[PDB]
Design a protein around this ligand. Sequence first.
Ligand SMILES: Nc1nc2c(ncn2[C@@H]2O[C@H](COP(=O)(O)OP(=O)(O)NP(=O)(O)O)[C@@H](O)[C@H]2O)c(=O)[nH]1
Ligand SMILES: Nc1nc2c(ncn2[C@@H]2O[C@H](COP(=O)(O)OP(=O)(O)NP(=O)(O)O)[C@@H](O)[C@H]2O)c(=O)[nH]1
Ligand SMILES: [Mg+2]
Ligand SMILES: [Mg+2]
Lengths: 171, 226, 507, 557, 134, 146
Amino acid sequence: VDVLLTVGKLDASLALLTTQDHHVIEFPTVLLPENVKAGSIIKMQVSQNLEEEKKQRNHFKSIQAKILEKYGTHKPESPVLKIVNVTQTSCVLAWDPLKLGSAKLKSLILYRRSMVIPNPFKVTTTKISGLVDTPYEFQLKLITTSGTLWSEKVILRTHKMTHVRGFYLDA
Amino acid sequence: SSVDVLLTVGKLDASLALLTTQDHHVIEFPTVLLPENVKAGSIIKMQVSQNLEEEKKQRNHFKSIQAKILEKYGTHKPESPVLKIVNVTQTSCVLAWDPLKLGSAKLKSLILYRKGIRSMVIPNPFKVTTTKISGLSVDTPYEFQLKLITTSGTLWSEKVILRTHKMTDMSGITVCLQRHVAIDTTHFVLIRAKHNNIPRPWVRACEVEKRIVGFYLDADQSTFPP
Amino acid sequence: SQTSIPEVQRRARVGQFDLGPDLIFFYCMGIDTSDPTSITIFASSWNAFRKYDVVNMIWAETFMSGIVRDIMIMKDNRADGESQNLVETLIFNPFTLEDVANNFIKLFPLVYEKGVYLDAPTHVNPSLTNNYLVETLVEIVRLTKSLEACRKMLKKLIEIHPEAVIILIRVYFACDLEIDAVDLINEQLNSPSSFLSHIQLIFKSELLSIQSEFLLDVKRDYKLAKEVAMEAVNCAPNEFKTWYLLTRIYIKLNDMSNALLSLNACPMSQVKEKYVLIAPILHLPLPLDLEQKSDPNLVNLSASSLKSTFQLAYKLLTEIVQITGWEQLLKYRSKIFVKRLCERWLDNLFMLLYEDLKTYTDWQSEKLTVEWELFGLCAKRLGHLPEAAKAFQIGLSQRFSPVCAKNLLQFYIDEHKRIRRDSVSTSSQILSSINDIDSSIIDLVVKICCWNHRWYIEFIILIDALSVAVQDMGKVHNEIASRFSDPVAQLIDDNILNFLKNFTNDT
Amino acid sequence: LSQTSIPEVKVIGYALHQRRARVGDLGPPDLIFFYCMGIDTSDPTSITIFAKKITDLFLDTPQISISSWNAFRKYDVNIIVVQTYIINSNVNMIWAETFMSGIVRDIMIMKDNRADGESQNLVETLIFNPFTSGDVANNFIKLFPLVYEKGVYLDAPTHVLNPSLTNNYLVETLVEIVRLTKSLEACRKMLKKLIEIHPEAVIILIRVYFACDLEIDAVDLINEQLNSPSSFLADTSHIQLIFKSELLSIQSEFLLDVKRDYKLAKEVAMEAVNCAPNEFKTWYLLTRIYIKLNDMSNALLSLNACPMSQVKEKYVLRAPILHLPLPNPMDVQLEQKSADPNLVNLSASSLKSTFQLAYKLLTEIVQITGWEQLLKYRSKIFVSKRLCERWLDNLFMLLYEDLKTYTDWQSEQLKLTVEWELFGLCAKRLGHLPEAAKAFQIGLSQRFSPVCAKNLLQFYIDEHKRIRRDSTSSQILSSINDIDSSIIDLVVKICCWNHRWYIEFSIILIDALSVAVQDMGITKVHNEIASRFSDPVAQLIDDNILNFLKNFTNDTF
Amino acid sequence: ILMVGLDGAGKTTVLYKLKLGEVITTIPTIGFNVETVSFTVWDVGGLDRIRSLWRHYYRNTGVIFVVDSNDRSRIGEAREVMQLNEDELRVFANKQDLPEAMSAAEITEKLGWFIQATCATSGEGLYEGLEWLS
Amino acid sequence: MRILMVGLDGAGKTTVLYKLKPTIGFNVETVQYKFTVWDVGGLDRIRSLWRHYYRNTEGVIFVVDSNDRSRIGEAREVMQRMLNEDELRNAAWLVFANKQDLPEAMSAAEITEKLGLHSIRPWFIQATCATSGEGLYEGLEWLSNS
Ligand SMILES: Nc1nc2c(ncn2[C@@H]2O[C@H](COP(=O)(O)OP(=O)(O)NP(=O)(O)O)[C@@H](O)[C@H]2O)c(=O)[nH]1
Ligand SMILES: Nc1nc2c(ncn2[C@@H]2O[C@H](COP(=O)(O)OP(=O)(O)NP(=O)(O)O)[C@@H](O)[C@H]2O)c(=O)[nH]1
Ligand SMILES: [Mg+2]
Ligand SMILES: [Mg+2]
């Protein structure tokens, strides 16, 4: 589609283009030739560029697929916790390295109400301080931005009697 | 020196369209000036080139029109009015003027002058080129001149003097030799529309008495030589 | 004399001042401020060229600016019959030891080149040619017919200001010199020795606008007027007058298709306003020389009180519907609009057009004097002149009305011009028809002038109106002194007739 | 909640008579003479219950007809205690619409004013907690689809130029309610049923997922709409195009606000522009990306082509003309004094609409380049150049005034509390948060002031998020605890100040106190307040904010 | 008595023929002439400029309308000016000596009271008209 | 005599109190010997509410879990900030080393070093066992000779 235009007013920034069908178009000067001046006749030939459309179409799909791959498709997994060692008045609980598909972990809470783990990624072990021959249960609560996932409840019985004063080095 | 720009079609309505470029330009553009399969979000190539062949064409056209306007209006400068005399009687006179020539003047008003603007103003200077002066004195000199008022200027000239005829002078008497009744008709010698106030062959009486002299078809009756 | 002087410094409120009236507590216009000694004879003028409130240059600028205010206050309000909103103002005739008209000319080049500071009329991109200073000059020269005085001055101005030749062209057209003007126009647009790269482009458009308007208003010839109007648009597509002319051409060329297109691309005035006349608020001495009434849909006509270019555009819209009709107009409308988008303001005018057509039809199919005014103005807007003249004449019988009188007066002026043109293309019929109009004009001019004197107005519409009769009949003075009283005839003599008798350079 | 904290204004019948002729946005607050918000107008019987609580207040000795409005259909519902009538500009639908419109007003009055710290201009208003006027939270969800499709009549926020079925005050209220109450399964169930008849409502479901901590589920859903042929986008050309732009805007903003990733965020932002170049948010996003990408050249170009809001305004409470029943300091006259003429006349302050948001980006640009280097960029691309959009040029004038003020202050420092506010707000506008917090903290010592308290509170919130994002053990335990205590200390003070001016609801304070609750237990927070403050004060915070978190959050804790 | 009529009718000639009994050289009257002949005759100019000033003399007025019989062209103009509708006023066929002058009977038809054929130069039928006026 | 008995959670405060006669709140009982003891919860949630009872306190019984080695550092911080309280300026200080029956329990001399009681009003530490009742009345005897 080619149409002949007449240059009305011409400023350093914009321009007024007038057609024979009484169209008035404000047009940026930088897209006009250098020797346009004012009161000149310009030939504007507008054509569709299909190959450039196909380039952007492929580019857009590439970006959308890239976003889906990075964020999404990969979900956070199970907060599995195990038993290291149990005494009579204390026990040491641990959990496999937390695997999170996408950021981020909001909070890691133990359930038996218990406190929140300060460094879940650096320290994967927690020792219950106060507790003889009494059944207890534990389970982890993984609160992430992707969702909250709690599983693997573990029950245990504390051992019986069957960072010792008389066996001290100063006794 | 053609400038090639790649633009993206933003919003698109039935009338206008918003074109976006990589340098963040938002151009309001008529949809009718766009291809048929434009849709929305499509990439178009706009080639803006100067048309030198069209510039000289409009230049030649502009100078042609201006020259034609000059030739019709603003070239012919008209025109002194020529005042003439048709016929003079004892108590009246008929004045006339040559067809007023005005190429593109245009005429505003034509005023008769007899020692001032005391006389009347011509109603139809083009349709009627003759006027008759009614009230005059016997054997008395007069002078007349026409004032042509035109929107290209006022041009008046050619003042004419005349003296009304005496009672013994019958050279101004015209009857019905004229077959048709005109303005300078003085006398009229089966009903017709006829005259408004124009006064029997009386003509023989004026020849015998050697002066202008009752001769109605209603009055009393009282010989034409062959 | 004591009366015709309203009464009611203390408002240095400057900083916020266009043209700017002279405060004397009452305001006054038409005072000769060219010389301080001449002012003392009369006993605070303001100039917009240099914003200061009142050596020779000082009295010069304040005089010129004063005269501009005195003239433009009557010319910008010509559409509303020179209506006066401010009551406490006393307006004298600016034209009536030295003739002000001749003084304005000799003092013109000294104040030239600063006329841009006076801005431009509301329908105008101001310049050295298009401004209130030049508009005032061409108006003074036209009224006083001082051709040889203005012509001599302008010719000296061209030597140093070649662009001032445009002013001389406008003077020639006003002082009956078409051929000399067109010869001068073509000289600027064709001859290589003309002054006609950025400053000149706005000058070229003005020349094309003048030439195209000249081709349109007179000499008919719409074909050649079209080719120039389009060239005027290509020079200034942001100007109103350029598109306004082209639209008028299309209407006369019976092309309503492009008439609507050109009207749509026609830019409107959204900021500038018409020139009108210190302390928000009386003594009203009536010189010797009321409404309070109710049709709700008749007074609420939005088509009334339209200002700026919106009014002029509406006049063309009514001119189009006069030929096509409302049904055919909508067919054209729906054909070229939603295609291209309508500029909203045009769409609003269609709504206003419907209201006037509804009102006009409901009236004719089917009253207080005010109701006759409102309907009369409605019929005038739609282009029904003889139907509007009847309404104004009927409303003028039950009571006196300035709106009715001024509009009925304008009717006889248009009717007078019509007959004189039709007579060219019986004799007794013409002589009688013209005479009847002249008498009716004089009868109306006296009444309006007497009404103006009552509201402290001693000064263009009435002068031109009575001037029509003067060109026809010599006799005018005795015509007034006959039908009216002696002191009334003396009033008309001072206000209007004295100007025509002497201050018109023996026209 | 007893007789006090109820303002009044005195000829009988002056109230409704001025309301009757002013019928010709969301509308005015519920007039009772005093105004009131947060009333459960879902049922006329529930209204009589509210009136019952009011008429049970008429007893005892005071120490000297409600009318709700809906914007969906412009008519006023008046109920006198029982006469019930309608004032113009199926029975269940009437009470349904007026309730929804009521809740929208109660929420948007606190959300549109979030920038100004939920400032209240109208004194005679009594604001209740809309969530505790039940269940209102669950009732809004079940009653949402019945009022849907008419949400466009509520228009949109001032930053939204082109409203739709997705971008409007109704949806903005919904996503805010669901976020605060954490009613995911309730809203998700409702929206899924709405998609069946309105497939374009999936955009709303995406926003809910983002708000209710479901990023992956949201992005997976976004990709489904922008790629899969079975999407509603692939089926007009303008109604569908604005839906695509919103999806691109959400996706791009998600990439920007979180997940860093400015590169991928840019590619989506530009596509959002190509879908809606007349929209503000599209250009606003792209400008933010450019700033984050350290590309100040195109940042100024994108900021210039950014459309502004020139008509629409933020929602505020509006017969023009008092009884003030007083319910620790709270004393004497503030301001009414002299101040630095160039400090109070700062035009950069009181910026409204998009002009405020644009100024924030401008200060973010000058922070990196500097004023001298900014003029080099400015003179390079402004008057192969383009014309400045005037409003942008004006912001440069405003920027120069703030930089001068801030520099003249810091050079001097190297003052009245109100003067500390003005400088603090000035430093905050330029992006100098820690220097502004000091100004607010200094002004907080000599006097209370709501501006200083609200701004210093937001500082600790930002400081809290910063540590959690950047993250020894001992440093974390001490830094967080000190912040949490300072947060609680400020929340209590502001809430007590709001209660004095008849305000029982503040979204800012609810979100603020929620920060500590996530860290320390719901019961620990209460005892923290009851320790440092008195018992009735702790009870006040318990009723206004803590009761909401304890129960009306669907067992989030 | 108010004596009016078109210009050149012979009004001044008639007036001073009854007053002085002598035919004086008359000129176009720019104003008016009043003489007592006891008939107080008011002679006003017949030009278009002065013709408008006739209204001033209509009050307390017999009316003598002098008509130029010889001038055929302006017999229509003489009719319109006379065509009597004035509330304040609720014919001399002059120049009968000239050949082309209309008869008294013809003018009566054109005008459509008493008409008298007069001749101011000779004085014929002047006193005849005055007798009827008494 | 008014006594405030505090300490960490699981120390055995309630056990000690009702031997002479998780706590979400407090328990107050009057015990006769030859003492109005105020027992407040030791949980982190209730630990802040201890200041309300600091006033008019004549004696303070700090129960310490001898068996629990891990929270002896936590037990130190809580005690050191109580000694700086103006309300507990003249109040006596009685430290109970509870759960002394358990094998891994620290000796009274060892706990005294960890708590830093030698840096101090009159104070005394006593090895106690709430389950058996050993050394409970012994502590009350010193608490009466304040
Ligand atoms: N032949 C002839 N001429 C006459 C007669 N009466 C008047 N005239 C002429 O008519 C001319 C006009 O005379 P005048 O009395 O001035 O007429 P008027 O009506 O007074 N004119 P105006 O009023 O306009 O001054 C004179 O030249 C006079 O001689 C008459 O009976 N016969
Ligand atoms: N072996 C042993 N266990 C004891 C002794 N005293 C208390 N316990 C045990 O310690 C546990 C905690 O008892 P409790 O009195 O509730 O401790 P507390 O300090 O009151 N806890 P809290 O104050 O937080 O409620 C109980 O299981 C109890 O049997 C003791 O002397 N020896
Ligand atoms: Mg005479
Ligand atoms: Mg206990």
